[PDB]
Design a binder for this molecule. Structure first.
Ligand SMILES: *[C@@H]1O[C@H](CO)[C@@H](O)[C@H](O)[C@H]1NC(C)=O
Lengths: 110, 123, 31
């Protein structure tokens, strides 16, 4: 069973660009665009990116990122305090016929 | 605004069964596919079950296959998950998920997430 | 400042839908 791979935790100073990488098998990420979810600790997950770069209403333009090949990249710019959250990349797998959820990356500011 | 009410989650013994009920409001229930996602605290999100407009079962997580049953009623606007052979691994927080794509085959993302209920499986 | 859908709270069991050109010192008579 393919598992989406994400770095455990990332820390950056406010105003520093943040890159998050999601690693998946060709059948999952290659067939359908990954969906990013921003979950604040102790809160229900909120969709951050739909169909890769496209952003759902209520998501800041500074949030960005491009998926190339089997890797999905989330780019965060103009980072601020209180933006700390756990990010999950989710892409359904045609071969596995099950939705796949990434381990998650713990973004934070000191 | 879509609100996903969560209930039927409580401390339960391992060799027992438990039903989880999700309440759907602010959108047509039949029009949008509904999915179950659980996340144990300190662990990554894990997809558990999926269903569609025709109420056909999209599938179950391999770990929960044959122990979990998913069903929904379009008229009642509610979906119910039946859990059997509950284990410590099963213990997690089950959040209702609203899916924009009924087939959920491709480009399917969860527009809204339920607050969730805490299933605890212990002796 | 549009207050929309404030005319009801629950909407279930839809049975008929229809969208067309809107009906509306000008008199607007209806029957
Ligand atoms: C829905 O409407 C139909 C016909 O108007 C009626 O027979 C049925 O009982 C209704 N069900 C609910 C749940 O409102």
């Amino acid at each position: 069973q393919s598992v989406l791979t994400q770095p455990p935790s990332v820390s950056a100073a406010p105003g520093q660009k943040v890159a998050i990488s999601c690693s998946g098998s060709t059948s999952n990420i290659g067939d359908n665009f990954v969906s990013w979810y921003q979950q604040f600790p102790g809160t229900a997950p909120k969709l951050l990116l739909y169909d890769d770069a496209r952003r759902p209403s209520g998501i800041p333009d500074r949030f960005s990122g491009s998926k190339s090949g089997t890797s999905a990249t989330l780019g965060i710019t103009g980072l601020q305090t209180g933006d700390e959250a756990v990010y999950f990349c989710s892409t359904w797998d045609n071969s596995l016929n099950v939705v796949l959820f990434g381990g998650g990356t713990k973004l934070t500011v000191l | 605004e879509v609100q996903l009410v969560e209930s039927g989650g409580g401390l339960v013994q391992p060799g027992r069964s438990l039903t989880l009920s999700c309440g759907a409001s602010g959108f047509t229930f039949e029009d949008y596919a509904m999915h179950w996602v659980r996340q144990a605290p300190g662990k990554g999100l894990e997809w558990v079950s999926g269903i569609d407009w025709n109420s056909g079962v999209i599938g179950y997580a391999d770990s929960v296959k044959g122990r979990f049953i998913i069903s929904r009623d379009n008229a009642k606007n509610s979906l119910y998950l039946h859990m059997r052979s509950l284990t410590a691994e099963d213990t997690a927080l089950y959040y209702c998920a609203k899916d924009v794509y009924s087939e959920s085959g491709s480009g399917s993302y969860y527009d809204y997430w339920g607050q969730g209920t805490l299933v605890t499986v212990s002796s | 400042m549009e207050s929309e859908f404030r005319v009801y709270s629950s909407a279930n069991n839809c049975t008929f839908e229809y969208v067309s050109q809107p009906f509306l010192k000008n008199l607007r008579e209806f029957v």
